[PDB]
Symmetry: D2
Subunit: 440 residues, 4 copies
Amino acid sequence: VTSKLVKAHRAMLNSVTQEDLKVDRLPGADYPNPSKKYSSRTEFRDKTDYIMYNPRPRDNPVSVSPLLCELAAARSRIHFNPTETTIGIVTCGGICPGLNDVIRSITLTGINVYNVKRVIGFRFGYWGLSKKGSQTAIELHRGRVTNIHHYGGTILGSSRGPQDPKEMVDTLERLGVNILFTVGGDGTQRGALVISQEAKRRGVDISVFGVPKTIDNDLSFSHRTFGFQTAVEKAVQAIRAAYAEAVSANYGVGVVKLMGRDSGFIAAQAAVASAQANICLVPENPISEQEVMSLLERRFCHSRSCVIIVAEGFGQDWGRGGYDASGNKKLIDIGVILTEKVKAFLKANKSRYPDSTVKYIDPSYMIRACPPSANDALFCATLATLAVHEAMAGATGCIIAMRHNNYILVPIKVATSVRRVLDLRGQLWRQVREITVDLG
Amino acid sequence: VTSKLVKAHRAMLNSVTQEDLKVDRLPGADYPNPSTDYIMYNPRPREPSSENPVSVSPLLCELAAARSRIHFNPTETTIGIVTCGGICPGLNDVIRSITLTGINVYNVKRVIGFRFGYWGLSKKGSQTAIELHRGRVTNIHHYGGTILGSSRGPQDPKEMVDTLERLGVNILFTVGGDGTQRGALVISQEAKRRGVDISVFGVPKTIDNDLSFSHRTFGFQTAVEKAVQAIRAAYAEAVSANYGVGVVKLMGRDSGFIAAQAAVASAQANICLVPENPISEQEVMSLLERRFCHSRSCVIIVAEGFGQDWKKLIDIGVILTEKVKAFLKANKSRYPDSTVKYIDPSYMIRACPPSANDALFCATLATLAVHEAMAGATGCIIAMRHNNYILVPIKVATSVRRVLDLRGQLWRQVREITVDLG
Amino acid sequence: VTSKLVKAHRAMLNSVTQEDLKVDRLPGADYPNPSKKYSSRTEFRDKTDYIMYNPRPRDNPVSVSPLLCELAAARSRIHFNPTETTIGIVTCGGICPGLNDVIRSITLTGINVYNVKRVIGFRFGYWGLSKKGSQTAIELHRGRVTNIHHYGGTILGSSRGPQDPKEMVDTLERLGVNILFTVGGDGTQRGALVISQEAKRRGVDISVFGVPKTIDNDLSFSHRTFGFQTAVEKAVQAIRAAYAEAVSANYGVGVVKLMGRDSGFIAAQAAVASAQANICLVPENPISEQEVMSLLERRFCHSRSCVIIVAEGFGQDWGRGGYDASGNKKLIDIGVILTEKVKAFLKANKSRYPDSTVKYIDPSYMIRACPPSANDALFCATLATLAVHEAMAGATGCIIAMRHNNYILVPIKVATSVRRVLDLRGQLWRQVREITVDLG
Amino acid sequence: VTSKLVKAHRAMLNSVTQEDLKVDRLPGADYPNPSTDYIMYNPRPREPSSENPVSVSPLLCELAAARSRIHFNPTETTIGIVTCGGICPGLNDVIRSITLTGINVYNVKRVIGFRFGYWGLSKKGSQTAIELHRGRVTNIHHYGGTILGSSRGPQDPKEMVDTLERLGVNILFTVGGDGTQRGALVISQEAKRRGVDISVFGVPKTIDNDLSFSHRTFGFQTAVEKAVQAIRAAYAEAVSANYGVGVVKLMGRDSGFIAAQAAVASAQANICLVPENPISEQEVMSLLERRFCHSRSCVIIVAEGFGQDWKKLIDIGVILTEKVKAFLKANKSRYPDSTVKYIDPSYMIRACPPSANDALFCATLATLAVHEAMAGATGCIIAMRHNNYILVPIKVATSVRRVLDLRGQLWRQVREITVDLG
Ligand code: NA
Ligand code: NA
Ligand code: NA
Ligand code: NA
């Protein structure tokens, strides 16, 4: 299998039990779905349906695991009174492709399908929910979100770091927010849980529901998250430039840094797609610099070109601690360090190689600020439509995720305790090995 | 979910058991690899009712993977490849990935590419067959179509096996629709009848994503991307004219997965006509009229398999356009000036290079095809289901087909986006 | 030289003399340019500067021609009172890439540089200037045109065909329009002259100034017109698909129809750029179908693939008269006719070719409704900025054009009397010959 | 216009006459082509003052074209090619177009590609030289960089001519900046000194469009396209942050043509810093402050040759970013939260495949290079001026360089778009 699950190095849960996977529901479902009609009643869920966590049998087959995930879907009875609920939205953390699509789909689903009273968009991450920031909140309506999905970034703006929980819920009450969608990563969702808790503490009828993005932070759970496919498309473009460079320099080395904090899916997938990576360094396979110089040496033994792909989360054990504004582990710029090591190594071996050039490409911002591909737009629209369905039906303290080709609901405590990482003995990483230089 | 199953026009099985899903393996695996876990067909249970959930279905699907003990003698194996049917993005990625994995992970004796489908296997065509080596395939993944060439239609299995036998092929990879796979079974059967040690392994091809026991086929994602661009052009044209209608034809012989996904992805379609929901021209005209009551523009997406009651179909893109023009003429009073632009981006969708993501996909399918074939698998196709890679016998894969579920979340989204009758 | 000039087959002028090239100027220049300051006075023209029509010497060198074109530029003295002038805009004919960029640049130049009183945008071509249509006129302001250049088509809309001249000028007076920009082709500009005349007839202080587009109509004068470069980019994309198809079919023929009414620049240039065209048919080289079947036969004599590029204006002498709604010559669909002839020819020769497939691609709408490339956006912005400069300075009855890498002003009567056509003995067409199949 | 001339760091001429512009031709044109018109340097006159206008300048430029009588014996000529300096889009198109025109229009005896610039011509590198035939170049136009490889720096002309003489090269095409062209003259001179019948013909290369007697160089248009995409990303980042600053570095060692054009094309730059307008960091900070008085976002475009007073330059993209962060820190009171993102898309601009339009351009320049070279032209470069193709001696082309005219219509447009001091 291509990937596997491992405990996060900052997990809220020590071990996941069926109970940890139980999704919280605001008390009560006193309203029929405004879209449910006798003819389409078949399309609305009456009871919570599940799907196995691990569809592997032990040897009808029984799962190797006791865990079950709740499937997301439109419900026949809902918690909030449609024409009276107020939806809020905020995008936190770094930007990535698809944020505007999520904002647009949440907005249009609320207005068109639920005839919601109003949709509010908070500016620049949690700051927009602070006493001072609340002042900048805007009203999102059909006309304001019609063509935003054609641009990168977020029209709401974003920012890293949490805000005083007391202040944030204060503004949510002050504005009459019933559902708050938190779009963002690990830290973003940790804040979401804190807000959810503060609200629960005050007895306020509020749901906080997360729409996660992962390529740019420590979070990594779903088989697919919005923005990933677009990042791969652009990563490949960066890899092609790196290859053009490398092949154009006698003993030239094209170094391209890609995203990937604890997982190397982006790098691993761009490496295979481009079919032009010679060395691929991911977080799951931490190797020393001597082994890297060794792979390069083996490459330059029968070639004048070398393209090295390197995930930002790789080689963190190579040098000079703590967490950034979003709560992610601080990182040393492996892109810069590696490029230097390579230039030092080829320097001290100027005799084995007459001339040598090392070129470093960092396409980070061009990958993050890129507009989404059509396939991500479809995914973004679907993640968002289901998020509105489940939150209107009272789901709270959870994120909408995608596992085994199905949309599920996962409590935030679980989502931030486990990580989806490359299985070095999986089909994907085996292709990268086949394609890249071999130690032996 | 978003799809449902329906008996394929030509099914070999009319019900499925667990044995039907077990993959056929050539006898013996003596050689060590130069370097069977199952998955549930249906991961849904039946309730958190204390202790490990049991699947609602008895069926299990075998997972594709490289094996430690393989069937063919690596250094002595010859690989053959043929691409049949209509072209779609990724064919070259499949050819390349197969070639390089056989040449680099197994050091096979040689790789052979037969030209223009099964034609290239018959006495006559066998002449064009070419030797595939690293250099010949190293950069073909930047082009649309197939370097080998393709063609529709079967040939005599006797002649084809004569060809395989003469060229000493141990593994023949058949890249094509269920039609080319049906022929693959007939080739596999003739060979076993002669006692020849050859595996016939298929790699599914369909832009439609019509293939059962599958959630995604290569080329399908590239198509949605290009279809969306086409819709962008249709919208541009439509919005630029007073009472303008932009008609866009999209792939979709028996299913409307591309049209539906492209409709949601673009969020610019006003009417989406698919083969799973045939409707009268009267209704289409009523939907168009409804749209024009509150707008001066209308984008109409139509799948090639729609309106056949208005071996295969007739050009519905032209018929529809013709009737929209007529409908507007007849009402030139209500709609003073009107314009109808027709867009058929068909060959521009299936003939373009693959998107990076499809490239990754094609490469993975191919790499896994060689791993399971080298380990004896035959009479099956490689496929992707529930985010995992599985082997599926041909008789099962070609017995059923995927189609839109007019009640799934995908179609529900296009219904909300499009004009409604009531 | 790559191209040449020939008389139009519907010309208003029988012969062009220096007088025909004299640009009309509304009477009076009583205002200093609101942007001219002592420091930048150097940047504003005091007198009309010229450039040779034909920079070829006879043998300081003297031109082979007596003709001189007026150069476009910001003027020190202008005709209209800035804060009081009202600018109007209308886009007519078929759409092409760059219309929104022209609308945006005209609008922002008027507002930002001239502090114009208002900019009006007329809907759907001249119809928007009819008594009924005038009703739909919109007000264009900074906020309405900020991001339109990112989309294909025209936000104002377009339409073919003229309207009653009496009605159009009636609305221009009724709305206080001082400058009317006519964006479009041959027919578009013929209407512009008619409006200009009607206005002159009434003694109204109005300027009608044209911003031409050509790829989709009979017009063809400048060395470069907006939208052309983008059309070539897309045409090449269509040619690649046609090649993928052709090479994938035994004796397969990829037929792709491109724009080009009286000129084959698009086809000729896409043919060379793509380096994958085997046969290229343009209007300047009308050949019979027998000669085409002959070229295909020579191609299939040593190959299984044939890509045929065909300009819409080619082979009009191949069959079944008059003008369309925009005033262009009616055309028979050479794309369809040619594809049929090829299928008939390969049919009657099924013996020489076992199997054969002919695939026809018509990327017309995908080329016309495409957003502009960045280079066209730059060109569009510059054409439009200069158009506003010259019209504010009283220029009327003319179009802004580009010749020999310079922006010039050309009276409409001249622009519609001559055509820029491929010189079959020029460097461009010689490359196409080198690349394509040879008769001998 | 939009550019002006300035003495090149290393000019050979310090004034120009008509003789300097006349192209040097090898003696004799005996053979018929297997299948000199001038243009005015300045097409402006001096007044419609009755009867045929006379140019303000005496200079005339020779127009490139295929000739009926040529210098070399077609079937016996050997062609050599080398790409030097930094890579830019279109190099492969140039190599390909040269190869195919020589092989298809002249049937030259052979085409040779020397590797990694002039290095490939020295005794040592001469070893890597490869034979260029149809198949080896038929699809290289889909890749960035150069297949031949490139390198900066000169080699000994003695060794290089030894190489040319040994391999029997009649024509050597030098693709590179004025540096590689200066070296081309030195190669042409050594060869004539030995009495060897060889033409050295240059094809100008510069993303900057710095080359004099030229209005456009290949690669320049592709760069503007990619630069605009980079600016799009910078804007996205900037608009997404409270008081965000997106800093984008663009090609432009001594000129800011790319930055200026990309600034207007995108219409999203708030500050455009180019080498033709050096300014203090104090002023840049004042422009940024002005912007932040009425907005929460700021895009700053900066050419690599700007701020050198803050053989070549130091990374101004990093310096500028460093100082913007410091400037904002020092004013964290006025700007509570601020963010500075730096974008250096340099290698992604020059290492990508060419846009179709540049492809057309490269092909045309190349095709014309072979036509004039085969007809004896030497010591010159092919160029495009006033929409026409002309031949220009190297000594003239490398004596002057184009630079932005801060008073032309291009720069005036970026001034209007960007924040103003007053
Ligand atoms: Na190299
Ligand atoms: Na419309
Ligand atoms: Na073919
Ligand atoms: Na901002």
